[PDB]
Write a protein that binds this ligand. Structure first.
Ligand SMILES: OC[C@H]1O[C@@H](O)[C@H](O)[C@@H](O)[C@@H]1O
Ligand SMILES: OC[C@H]1O[C@@H](O)[C@H](O)[C@@H](O)[C@@H]1O
Lengths: 383, 383
């Protein structure tokens, strides 16, 4: 059941992403320094959003623990304990292993685990909960027995894992740093084209959350004037990173093409199966256009027309290079929709080109889908 | 149902306490600087325990949220978000309200909420979960609907509450600071005598957790060489505070008298109801002697012999002044037992007097219970 196990990783890694909108509303608006809001309000909102982003590794740990424990809050408490213990164990052991000052390591994040550390801590907590949450102790130790024993063993395992990972990290950490530097600053064009293609390829099976975690949460490192450091395209754009927003190509298809593809599916639908198909597809198009959720649109032609899905994946992969080359920069919280498009427009660049290239993308999607449905006789909804 | 509501507060405030043993094992041993352990091991364990104690307000928020949401992990995630948002909102607004530098406020903790802030955040998260965890949104916004909407509204409410409390705190905070200073440094004798008496009076109904939260977690302020600041007798003793350990009077009755009271109950039991009574009471005595859990012993004579319970409460209240005056200093993690007595003995003082005064307390309890059962015909277990 490896395939199902991988899915639970995707769902568990999605939950930390679902709480980004509150960070986007606060940090996105606050960092924009809108003239129609007092500076105090913007500063407070920015600080609140930065607080939300400072706990992202802990939120990931909680997500993993809840995903692998049927959403039990004691597992979340164990994840908190284990994440704290592991982070402090690594921070105190790594200077000894590397024989370098702790301050330099912290500043350069040589031993920093971040989201991966949160995932490891949450996995430890989930395993300890699943094994020991029914542990029977001697009658005179019955108090610590059960869910009460989970945090203690989780913390012990956490300190052990902290020592082990303080020994193990340097190589994998250097590899991760090199990959992040490449994909963020050296060749972001091909990097994010591949990201888009692989994400569309993985969306059918739920692994796109796993594939997104690096690009959305880890690659890149931006520090604001307050000294807080952000990792990933999403937090870095919300924080106000001029180099972020490389995921802006999501808008081009999510808000224009997939809705245009749905419109094409509606039009190509038979008249006897046209009204209901149009209702379903307009609902899906509105969903993808406002929130950015593509699954109602993509699942319609995911299996019946694999050729259409491959063409969509290629176009989506090309969307990100198009925006990067054209300078179109606008970020999202969870998925690329109109709400995120407007709320997060404060730090955007060339926001006017988005409707233009979007109309182009809609025309391309509509024409391609209509032509290939007529030619290849693809059985899109309503057939 | 106010009485039941108060109970849920006690249970919810107990859960943060139940994860103290891992802090006690690590911080208690690590801070002791035992010669039979390498300095590196002790330092690592101390840092891990300090990490556990740094998140105590967050652990309290999670406890409240889980207690008032039937232990749902999404409520814990909402509590994390809300606690972070509220803490940074207060830290950024209070300097404006008080017109004082933020650094001075943070150092002196003038606007610090701590455990109370965690409780407030957890209450916000629990209320928002209970109200909105079934919220129905427009079909095109269905993604944010449900448990996904709880963290966003919880964070908004958290920032609003942060502003309100940054306005409201100074008076109540000054009152709390004065009470803590008094009970910790000015008249700890009467303070902890009253604490013991009221704790024994509230144990029957579960409010003793609420009554303990201030003394255990808030009164006092100790900072170690690492710069971490601890609040409450328990963390301060674990950290190595010479002035802490005022709860050491718990041992005198929990490990000696209540077990001695159980032995007296066994002896006074009728021969036909003596073997099983002795088994039950020896199990209870072992529980209270090792872990410190008094409920098995106290509930035996709680209702049948209210006079005995009142005498026990008075003796327990006198226990803490006795230790304070005699200098007997030894701390606990959750309750006063032999495991905590040994593990946390590294920072103890006059550990030799504990068995002596304990034998005295056992003699007193045994004599009093036997005499009053023979005289007043109190129907202790086995009658
Ligand atoms: O699965 C929900 C959403 O997750 C986002 O990260 C993806 O970009 C979208 O394509 C998807 O609809
Ligand atoms: O209720 C469990 C335990 O809680 C502790 O805080 C009290 O000191 C004990 O008397 C009690 O047995």
């Amino acid at each position: 059941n490896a395939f199902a196990n991988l899915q639970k990783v995707g769902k568990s890694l999605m939950l930390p992403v679902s709480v980004l909108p509150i960070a986007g509303i606060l940090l996105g608006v606050g960092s924009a320094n809108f003239s129609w809001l007092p500076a105090v309000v913007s500063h407070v909102m920015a600080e609140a959003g930065g607080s939300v982003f400072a706990n992202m590794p802990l939120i990931f740990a909680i997500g993993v623990a809840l995903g692998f424990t049927n959403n039990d809050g004691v597992s979340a408490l164990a994840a908190v304990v284990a994440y704290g213990i592991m982070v402090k164990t690594m921070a105190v052991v790594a200077p000894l292993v590397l024989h370098l000052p702790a301050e330099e390591i912290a500043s350069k994040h040589l031993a920093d685990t971040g989201v991966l550390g949160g995932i490891i801590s949450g996995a430890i907590a989930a395993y300890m909960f699943n094994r020991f949450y029914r542990i029977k102790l001697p009658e005179y130790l019955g108090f610590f027995a059960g869910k009460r024993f989970v945090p203690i063993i989780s913390g012990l395992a956490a300190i052990f894992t902290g020592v082990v990972l303080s020994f193990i990290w340097p190589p994998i950490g250097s590899a991760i740093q090199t990959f992040s530097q490449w994909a963020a600053y050296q060749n972001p064009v091909v990097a994010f084209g591949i990201y888009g293609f692989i994400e569309r390829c993985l969306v059918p099976f739920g692994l796109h959350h796993i594939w997104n975690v690096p690009f959305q949460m880890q690659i890149g490192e931006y520090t604001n004037a307050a000294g807080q450091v952000f990792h990933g395209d999403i937090p870095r754009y919300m924080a106000g990173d001029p180099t972020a927003g490389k995921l802006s190509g999501g808008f081009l298809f999510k808000m224009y093409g997939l809705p245009a593809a749905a419109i094409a599916i509606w039009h190509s639908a038979k008249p006897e199966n046209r009204a209901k198909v149009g209702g379903i597809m307009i609902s899906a198009a509105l969903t993808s256009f406002l929130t950015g959720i593509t699954e109602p649109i993509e699942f319609s032609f995911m299996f019946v027309a694999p050729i259409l899905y491959i063409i969509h994946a290629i176009l989506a992969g090309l969307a990100f290079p198009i925006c990067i080359l054209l300078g179109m920069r606008d970020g999202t919280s969870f998925s690329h929709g109109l709400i995120d498009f407007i709320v997060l427009s404060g730090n955007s660049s060339k926001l006017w080109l988005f409707p233009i290239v979007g109309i182009g993308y809609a025309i391309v999607y509509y024409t391609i889908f209509r032509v290939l449905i007529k030619a290849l006789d693809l059985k899109t909804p309503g057939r």
